[PDB]
Design a protein around this nucleic acid. Structure first.
Ligand code: MG
Ligand code: MG
Ligand code: MG
Ligand code: MG
Ligand code: MG
Ligand code: MG
Ligand code: MG
Ligand code: MG
Ligand code: MG
Ligand code: MG
Ligand code: MG
Ligand code: MG
Ligand code: MG
Ligand code: MG
Ligand code: MG
Ligand code: MG
Ligand code: MG
Ligand code: MG
Ligand code: MG
Ligand code: MG
Ligand code: MG
Ligand code: MG
Ligand code: MG
Ligand code: MG
Ligand code: MG
Ligand code: MG
Ligand code: MG
Ligand code: MG
Ligand code: MG
Ligand code: MG
Ligand code: MG
Ligand code: MG
Ligand code: MG
Ligand code: MG
Ligand code: MG
Ligand code: MG
Ligand code: MG
Ligand code: MG
Ligand code: MG
Ligand code: MG
Ligand code: MG
Ligand code: MG
Ligand code: MG
Ligand code: MG
Ligand code: MG
Ligand code: MG
Ligand code: MG
Ligand code: MG
Ligand code: MG
Ligand code: ZN
Lengths: 61, 51, 91, 157
RNA sequence: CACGGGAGACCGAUAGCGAACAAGUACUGCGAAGGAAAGAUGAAAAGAACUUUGAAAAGAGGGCUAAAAGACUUGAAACCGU
RNA sequence: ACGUGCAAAUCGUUCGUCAAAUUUGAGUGUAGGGGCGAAAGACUAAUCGAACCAUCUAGUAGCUGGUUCCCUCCGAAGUUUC
RNA sequence: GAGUAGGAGGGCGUGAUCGUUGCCUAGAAGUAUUGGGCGUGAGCCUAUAUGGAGCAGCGAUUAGUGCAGAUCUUGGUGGUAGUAGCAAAUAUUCAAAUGAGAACUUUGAAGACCGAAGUGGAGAAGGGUUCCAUGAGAACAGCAAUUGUUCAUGGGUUACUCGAUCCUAAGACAUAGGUUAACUCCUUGCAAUACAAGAAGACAUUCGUUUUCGUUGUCAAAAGGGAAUGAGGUUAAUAUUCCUCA
RNA sequence: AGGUUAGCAGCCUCUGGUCCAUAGAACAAUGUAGAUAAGGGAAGUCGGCAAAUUGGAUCCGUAACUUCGGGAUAAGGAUUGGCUCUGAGGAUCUCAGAACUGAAGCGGACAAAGGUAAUCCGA
RNA sequence: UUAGUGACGCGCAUGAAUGGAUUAAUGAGAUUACCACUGUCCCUAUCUACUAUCUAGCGAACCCACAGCUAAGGGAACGGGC
């Protein structure tokens, strides 16, 4: 089961870089079923696809 | 690139159509020796002339 | 370097397609086609010069829309205005 | 693709034949796996090939010696050099399996099959290219296999 | 030279026009110009039903047919295996 | 270093110059005994002390190489003259 | 009774032609032979196997008539050899899933790299469907592959405001005139080596009529000049183009 | 884009991208690349080839020669961290002092000239 | 010190824009010292990565009369063959 397309679409939808995407490992088949973008947004709304917090870069020092 | 003549577009279209494989049912004719289309072409290995 | 590293620099193209003969023989800087010479307005080919040419481009090389039937109707006397007629003689 | 085996068995109800043709495995390697199988019990051949695959045993190199590694495993043979040409072994093994399943319809017993006549032939070489310095090109090919093996039943008194 | 006719102590698929074949074609060259390789299953597809082992290619059974002649007529030598 | 390359000129270190006689895209002017040259007989599509393509052209070769079946018989010259 | 260079006399073997005598689906040619023989030798006859349609002798006629070589032509193959080798560009690892098969596919979890002079986001030249989706046997992706820039099938490129199209440049080419056996060649924006070459208006609204002013062409810039658009949303693949709003 | 910095250098990072370059194991000679050698210091070699030394900034100090522009970072001599205070320059971030503290180290990586004296050419 | 520099000059064969003599700046331009410096050397050792190694997979090329142990001898005056 390749999710390549899932991930690209999810990226665009979330207006974020692919490496920020998180596709739930457990629900993967379900995700593979998403074809259209719309499917993707439903997916994100449902919580199967999420968007990772940015890598923390701090100015303390 | 992006920018093209009509002539170009049409020529490219032509060669694009001509680049199909022999239709699988032609090989069943009684008078033909043709197993395949010998004239097929791949953009990477052979280049057209358009300028 | 005259070699491989040199070849990278070739994106120019000195010829384009000649309306008349349709190869890329057209010289935009000289305004002529190296093969036919499209502007010249009579076909450029040197026959004695070198011998193969006519069999590549030349009369009979591509389909001849008009001439093929000329052979046939040459013998038939160039009929104009005639219609074929039944041997059965129906009136 | 109709196999003509160069050698024939004496009793063909008492024999089992396998052949595979136009394989992609290395000739010399296959050759020597086979050469090593000749004259054993089908069950033995299978055990020992499986053992080569598991690296606990070596397939002796006989005809094609060209710079082949010396192993302690070659003791079993009287030899210095041998290897573990896995691909070849797997293919051959598959062939032995076809031998055994090939015995089924015959209603023959496995225990008394002995291997006589392995035949490995150099098949038509598959062709491709290699780019060489100065803009030369040289051939890069593979030497394919034809294999055939038949098994006789021999009764042990 | 073109379209026709007929013919030959010609040639007979490395011969004969370069081309017996989607041949001035595939392909190369900015270009002028260069330019090949490639013909024969059988009288008829009857082009291999079906069983079995294989993930699959395929093997073993079994069958067509005068014959497998099965991607194909004959099938030499060099080379290689038994 | 590589030198049957990654490469028919590359790779590592190192080095010349780095706001001008600087670098650079396209378009446009110059073509073969002709161009073009801060001049090296340099460059002119891997071709240059005269490009490339076809033709005269199977160019001529007192010179190099090859010159295809059997047997039997006779059997030389390396000297003379120009 | 020697013999290179060389010469002579006889003979062997190969096409095709005119004759003559014949052989072959009751198996010709060709091919293989550790079968049997014939010639001093070119070569021959037979046997067996294969083969599955044509052959052969004798007398002449004719010749693209005999190959070990020419760094000979074209094609096919060896030994070298499972050898040289697959080592630039810091890096991978774990579990799950999928599959006949996973170091090389997908998710997640870790560790590193390019470090905004990028291994990022978009263009011009060049490429031309390489883009998108689904599927996948062989081949190719110099290990591998369940993966692909590969194969098969279908589908994708919407504009008054972006660019071409218009303008002029370095330039260039017609026309006219002249040169050439002819082809060709020479001039032309400061426009002519040319010149009875144009434009506009109105009424008319055709002509015609009429009036006015007048020497005569075109091509060359997808970085130059250059009338006006934006944000938001949408597709698997297009969008300053489609949708919505302004 | 952030940090360091004279700096769009180098080195490290965030956004975005990527781990693609066939793999496993052994660890000999020879090799390719990378470093370090006690005592001496070019004796090596056609030749200091290669390597080594030098390197920033602040303060000192600076010849012959000259076309008076130059030479010139000439040559050479010192300093550089951390920490705790002090003073001066401005609107309605630079500079200087003092004291304390360490294996006397401190341009700690990165970055970064080795000099001198002659001879020959060509400005 | 056949090296470098300064002098002398019976200059093989120096000499005036076929330029002669000078010369600051200047140089990836020729040469000689010296200072610093050092694995260039005495004199060679050790450490890292990639190779060579071995393995799974993949897999060329040069070249090749015939081949491959020597001593002498003779021989187209250095044989592998006699
Ligand atoms: Mg284009
Ligand atoms: Mg290409
Ligand atoms: Mg090409
Ligand atoms: Mg045609
Ligand atoms: Mg025609
Ligand atoms: Mg076979
Ligand atoms: Mg290579
Ligand atoms: Mg079968
Ligand atoms: Mg048969
Ligand atoms: Mg043999
Ligand atoms: Mg370099
Ligand atoms: Mg002479
Ligand atoms: Mg003939
Ligand atoms: Mg019969
Ligand atoms: Mg006879
Ligand atoms: Mg028979
Ligand atoms: Mg005769
Ligand atoms: Mg012959
Ligand atoms: Mg021969
Ligand atoms: Mg070979
Ligand atoms: Mg290498
Ligand atoms: Mg990369
Ligand atoms: Mg990019
Ligand atoms: Mg992009
Ligand atoms: Mg102009
Ligand atoms: Mg002009
Ligand atoms: Mg505008
Ligand atoms: Mg609009
Ligand atoms: Mg390794
Ligand atoms: Mg020392
Ligand atoms: Mg010293
Ligand atoms: Mg010392
Ligand atoms: Mg040095
Ligand atoms: Mg001064
Ligand atoms: Mg100083
Ligand atoms: Mg000085
Ligand atoms: Mg202090
Ligand atoms: Mg102070
Ligand atoms: Mg102190
Ligand atoms: Mg220091
Ligand atoms: Mg020095
Ligand atoms: Mg100079
Ligand atoms: Mg000395
Ligand atoms: Mg002296
Ligand atoms: Mg100097
Ligand atoms: Mg091991
Ligand atoms: Mg191996
Ligand atoms: Mg001697
Ligand atoms: Mg000897
Ligand atoms: Zn033309």
């Amino acid at each position: 089961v390749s999710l390549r397309l899932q991930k690209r679409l999810a990226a665009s939808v979330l207006k974020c870089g692919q490496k920020r995407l998180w596709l739930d490992p457990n629900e993967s088949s379900e995700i593979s079923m998403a074809n259209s973008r719309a499917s993707i947004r439903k997916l994100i709304k449902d919580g199967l696809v999420m968007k990772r917090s940015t890598v923390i870069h701090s100015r303390s020092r | 690139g992006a920018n093209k003549t009509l002539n170009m577009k049409k020529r490219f279209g032509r060669k694009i159509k001509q680049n199909r494989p022999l239709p699988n049912w032609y090989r069943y004719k009684s008078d033909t020796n043709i197993r395949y289309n010998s004239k097929r072409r791949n953009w990477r290995r052979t280049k057209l002339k358009i300028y | 370097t005259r070699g491989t590293p040199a070849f990278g620099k070739r994106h120019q193209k000195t010829h384009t397609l000649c309306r008349r003969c349709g190869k890329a023989t057209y010289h935009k800087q000289k305004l002529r086609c190296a093969a036919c010479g499209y502007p010249d307005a009579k076909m450029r080919r040197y026959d004695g010069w070198g011998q193969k040419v006519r069999d590549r481009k030349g009369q009979g090389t591509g389909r001849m829309r008009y001439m093929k039937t000329i052979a046939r109707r040459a013998k038939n006397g160039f009929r104009s205005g005639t219609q074929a007629a039944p041997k059965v003689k129906a009136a | 693709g109709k196999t003509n085996y160069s050698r024939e068995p004496a009793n063909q109800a008492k024999a089992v034949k396998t052949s595979a043709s136009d394989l992609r495995v290395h000739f010399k390697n296959t050759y020597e796996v086979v050469r090593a199988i000749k004259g054993l019990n089908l069950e033995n051949a299978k055990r020992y090939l499986k053992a080569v695959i598991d690296r606990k045993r070596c397939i002796p190199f006989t005809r094609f010696t060209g710079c082949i590694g010396r192993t302690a495993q070659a003791h079993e043979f009287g030899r210095t050099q041998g290897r573990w040409p896995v691909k070849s072994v797997k293919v051959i093994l598959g062939l032995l399996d076809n031998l055994s399943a090939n015995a089924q319809a015959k209603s023959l017993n496995t225990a008394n099959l002995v291997i006589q006549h392995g035949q490995v032939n150099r098949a038509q070489k598959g062709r491709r290219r290699t780019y060489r310095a100065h803009g030369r090109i040289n051939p890069y090919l593979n030497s394919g296999c034809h294999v055939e093996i038949f098994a006789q039943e021999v009764a042990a008194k």
